[PDB]
Each structure stands twice: as C-alpha cells, then as structure tokens.
Design an enzyme around this catalytic site. Structure first.
Site, PDB file in Angstrom:
ATOM      1  N   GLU A 255     -11.671   9.187  -7.662  1.00  0.00           N
ATOM      2  CA  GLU A 255     -12.915   8.819  -8.319  1.00  0.00           C
ATOM      3  C   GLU A 255     -12.647   8.007  -9.585  1.00  0.00           C
ATOM      4  O   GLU A 255     -11.520   7.568  -9.827  1.00  0.00           O
ATOM      5  CB  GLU A 255     -13.655  10.113  -8.664  1.00  0.00           C
ATOM      6  CG  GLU A 255     -15.082   9.983  -9.133  1.00  0.00           C
ATOM      7  CD  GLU A 255     -15.712  11.346  -9.332  1.00  0.00           C
ATOM      8  OE1 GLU A 255     -15.212  12.112 -10.185  1.00  0.00           O
ATOM      9  OE2 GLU A 255     -16.698  11.655  -8.628  1.00  0.00           O
TER      10      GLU A 255
ATOM     11  N   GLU B 167      -5.761  -0.068   3.236  1.00  0.00           N
ATOM     12  CA  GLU B 167      -4.771   0.585   4.079  1.00  0.00           C
ATOM     13  C   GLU B 167      -4.713   1.987   3.448  1.00  0.00           C
ATOM     14  O   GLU B 167      -4.763   2.108   2.231  1.00  0.00           O
ATOM     15  CB  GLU B 167      -3.431  -0.135   3.887  1.00  0.00           C
ATOM     16  CG  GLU B 167      -2.210   0.649   4.304  1.00  0.00           C
ATOM     17  CD  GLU B 167      -0.928   0.085   3.715  1.00  0.00           C
ATOM     18  OE1 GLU B 167       0.156   0.555   4.110  1.00  0.00           O
ATOM     19  OE2 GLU B 167      -0.997  -0.818   2.851  1.00  0.00           O
TER      20      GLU B 167
ATOM     21  N   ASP C 229      -3.402  -2.507 -15.186  1.00  0.00           N
ATOM     22  CA  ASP C 229      -3.619  -1.075 -15.373  1.00  0.00           C
ATOM     23  C   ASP C 229      -2.706  -0.182 -14.530  1.00  0.00           C
ATOM     24  O   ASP C 229      -3.165   0.747 -13.848  1.00  0.00           O
ATOM     25  CB  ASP C 229      -5.094  -0.723 -15.122  1.00  0.00           C
ATOM     26  CG  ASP C 229      -5.445   0.682 -15.591  1.00  0.00           C
ATOM     27  OD1 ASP C 229      -4.859   1.144 -16.597  1.00  0.00           O
ATOM     28  OD2 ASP C 229      -6.315   1.321 -14.961  1.00  0.00           O
TER      29      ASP C 229
HETATM   30  C1  FRT Z   1      -8.407  13.359  -8.435  1.00  0.00           C
HETATM   31  O1  FRT Z   1      -7.721  13.430  -7.162  1.00  0.00           O
HETATM   32  C2  FRT Z   1      -6.581  12.556  -7.050  1.00  0.00           C
HETATM   33  C3  FRT Z   1      -5.945  12.725  -5.669  1.00  0.00           C
HETATM   34  N1  FRT Z   1      -4.764  11.847  -5.522  1.00  0.00           N
HETATM   35  S1  FRT Z   1      -4.001  12.027  -3.971  1.00  0.00           S
HETATM   36  O2  FRT Z   1      -4.593  13.312  -3.235  1.00  0.00           O
HETATM   37  O3  FRT Z   1      -2.430  12.174  -4.185  1.00  0.00           O
HETATM   38  C4  FRT Z   1      -4.349  10.605  -3.047  1.00  0.00           C
HETATM   39  C5  FRT Z   1      -4.550   9.381  -3.722  1.00  0.00           C
HETATM   40  C6  FRT Z   1      -4.828   8.220  -2.967  1.00  0.00           C
HETATM   41  C7  FRT Z   1      -4.907   8.281  -1.538  1.00  0.00           C
HETATM   42  N2  FRT Z   1      -5.184   7.131  -0.701  1.00  0.00           N
HETATM   43  C8  FRT Z   1      -5.389   5.714  -0.902  1.00  0.00           C
HETATM   44  N3  FRT Z   1      -4.889   4.828  -0.038  1.00  0.00           N
HETATM   45  C9  FRT Z   1      -5.106   3.520  -0.269  1.00  0.00           C
HETATM   46  C10 FRT Z   1      -5.845   3.071  -1.393  1.00  0.00           C
HETATM   47  C11 FRT Z   1      -6.357   4.089  -2.290  1.00  0.00           C
HETATM   48  C12 FRT Z   1      -7.117   3.751  -3.476  1.00  0.00           C
HETATM   49  C13 FRT Z   1      -7.957   2.594  -3.582  1.00  0.00           C
HETATM   50  N4  FRT Z   1      -8.562   2.490  -4.807  1.00  0.00           N
HETATM   51  C14 FRT Z   1      -8.058   3.606  -5.419  1.00  0.00           C
HETATM   52  C15 FRT Z   1      -8.538   3.811  -6.872  1.00  0.00           C
HETATM   53  N5  FRT Z   1      -7.164   4.470  -4.723  1.00  0.00           N
HETATM   54  C16 FRT Z   1      -6.437   5.751  -5.144  1.00  0.00           C
HETATM   55  C17 FRT Z   1      -5.452   5.500  -6.302  1.00  0.00           C
HETATM   56  C18 FRT Z   1      -7.431   6.887  -5.503  1.00  0.00           C
HETATM   57  N6  FRT Z   1      -6.100   5.399  -1.997  1.00  0.00           N
HETATM   58  C19 FRT Z   1      -4.699   9.534  -0.884  1.00  0.00           C
HETATM   59  C20 FRT Z   1      -4.420  10.702  -1.637  1.00  0.00           C
END
Ligand code: FRT
Length: 276
Positions: free
Chosen positions: A12, A72, A118
């Site tokens: 988020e 992806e 960032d």
């Molecule tokens: C608060 O909870 C945090 C949990 N972190 S996690 O469970 O280790 C986790 C983080 C990211 C992802 N997957 C993902 N894949 C491609 C682009 C993307 C993506 C595209 N735009 C953004 C901002 N992102 C991620 C950086 C969120 N996020 C899967 C699991």
C-alpha cells in the site's frame, strides 16, 4: 480491470495500493497497482525500459480517470527478507550478488536517462531463483532513510547519483542488519548523515554551501572510519561503499564504474532460502 481477479492486497501507500491478482482469462498471476496527460507518456516510456533486474511493467490500463499498472509478480521484498534474516543476517555472497544485480539494473536505467529516485528495501523484490529487481520506478509516511544529501539540501536538478547513494545505504543495511541513517525528519536525516560522514564543506563538496537549504549554522561533525560503520565488511566492500556514499554527486561512483570494482572480483549468484 474486468480481466483481473484480486487475490489479495500486497502492499500500500505512496503511488497507490498494490494487489496480487490473476488474469481471469490466462490465469497469469500479476501485481496490480491502483494509482491515485504527462504521466501517461512518462509511464508508457517505462514499458520499454526492460531489464532482468527491473520488475517488468506488463500493461498500463487507463480507464474512468483511473490508472492501473500491471506488473510481473514477485513473491517478496527485501525488507521482509532482511527481517527474516535478522538472526544470522544475509550471507555475504548473497549480499554481493544482490548489490551486483541492482547496479546492473541501475546502470541500465541510468544509461537511458531514467532515475528511480526512491530506492529502498521495500521496493526491491526477490524470487527463488536468486534474482532481485527494482520496482516502483515512476517519475506522509515515506522513509527518508535512503535519500541522497543533494536532494535533502534542496538540489532541484539532482542526478542518477542519487540512486547510487540509496543503494549504498541499502548495502550497508544488509551487511549490518540495521538501517544506516534512520532519519525521522528531513533535518534529522541530514544530521544522521553528517554525524557519520562528517558535516560536508567546500573541501569535500565544492558548491555545497551555495545549496538552497544549506545553512552555515549546521553543526560541524567529524567523519568516522567505515571500519566503524559496517564492521564485518571486508576492505573491498568498505572501499566500494565509501565511493557510493561520496558527498559530491559528481564524485560518487557511477553504477557502471561500480560494476568494475574489485569487490565483485569473486561475485556469484547464490540462491536465498525463501519460505513462501
Ligand atoms: C506492508 O506489506 C508489505 C509486504 N511486502 S511482501 O509480502 O514481501 C511483497 C511485496 C511485493 C510483492 N509483489 C510485487 N511484484 C511486482 C511488483 C510489485 C509492486 C508494484 N508496485 C509496488 C509498490 N510493489 C511492491 C513493492 C509492494 N509487487 C509480493 C510480496
């Protein structure tokens, strides 16, 4: 959006909310980002910035004044992986591999005049294959921990060197298992940098005193040896880190030059232990 099925809310904040979702037709799993004109053309130019170490931007869906980015899907970010490694820390070979891959990724975006601006553990994603990728490029509660000093001092036209600074901070954090400069306000961030690297002046940073937010009243702290900043790191690593944390953006090592540093003399590609 009628072609997707939200599986769960991944992350988020900032640019919007991210969900894990499945393509109702192909069953392909992706990361769906709901963003909160110029942006359109800029985002589109991103769909061409393809690299193994850049989370691939599959599609850009603009509908009803709403912008959806289809990426992806990767299973975990570096933040979560570091937290899960805190007890014993990430093995050097793996730290070196991740840094090497990110520099490759940066050298690529930088060559195309694109900066991330960032970088942080939360937007570095990893898979079971040992790859790590840059996510959330683009163009409150946001961490300032990885912000380059020129940005903090008000530089309006900062360079690709800012990504190098952020990566250096992340490098140190993987090695020590603790954030290097955990500022909680812009001035605190700046002062944490000053206390560790020394209050910058015209000697180490020509022009620094003429910067927008630079104040002659800044306290004057003396620099500390990197032997004390990232202890476990061998001399090659400490040498590289110091060049990635140079005050003068024009003196800070570039990603491409960083890829030639001796620290990567014995670089490999280990596989992490992921508990998905
Ligand atoms: C608060 O909870 C945090 C949990 N972190 S996690 O469970 O280790 C986790 C983080 C990211 C992802 N997957 C993902 N894949 C491609 C682009 C993307 C993506 C595209 N735009 C953004 C901002 N992102 C991620 C950086 C969120 N996020 C899967 C699991």
């Amino acid at each position: 959006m009628e072609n997707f099925q939200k599986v769960e809310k991944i992350g988020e904040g900032t640019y919007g909310v991210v969900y894990k979702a499945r393509n109702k037709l192909t069953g392909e799993v992706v990361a769906l980002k709901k963003i909160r004109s110029t942006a359109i053309r800029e985002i589109s130019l991103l769909k061409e910035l393809n690299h193994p170490n850049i989370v691939k931007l599959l599609d850009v869906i603009h509908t009803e004044n709403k912008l959806y980015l289809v990426f992806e899907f990767l299973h975990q970010d570096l933040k979560k992986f570091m937290d899960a490694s805190a007890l014993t820390g990430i093995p050097l070979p793996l730290i070196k591999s991740y840094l090497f891959q990110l520099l490759q990724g940066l050298a690529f975006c930088h060559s195309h005049r694109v900066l991330h601006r960032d970088l942080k553990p939360q937007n570095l994603l990893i898979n079971t294959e040992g790859a790590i990728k840059l996510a959330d490029f683009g163009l409150e509660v946001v961490t300032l921990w990885y912000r380059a000093p020129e940005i903090l001092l008000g530089c309006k036209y900062y360079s690709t060197a800012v990504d190098i600074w952020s990566l250096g901070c992340i490098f140190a954090e993987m090695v020590t298992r603790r954030a290097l400069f955990p500022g909680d306000s812009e001035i605190d961030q700046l002062f944490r940098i000053f206390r560790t690297l020394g209050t910058p002046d015209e000697v180490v940073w020509p022009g620094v005193t003429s910067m927008p937010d630079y104040k002659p009243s800044f306290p004057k702290w003396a620099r500390q040896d990197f032997s004390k900043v990232v202890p476990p790191l061998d001399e090659d690593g400490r040498s590289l880190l110091s060049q990635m944390l140079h005050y003068d953006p024009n003196k800070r090592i570039s990603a491409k030059a960083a890829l030639a540093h001796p620290f990567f003399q014995d670089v490999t590609k280990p596989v992490p232990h992921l508990r998905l």
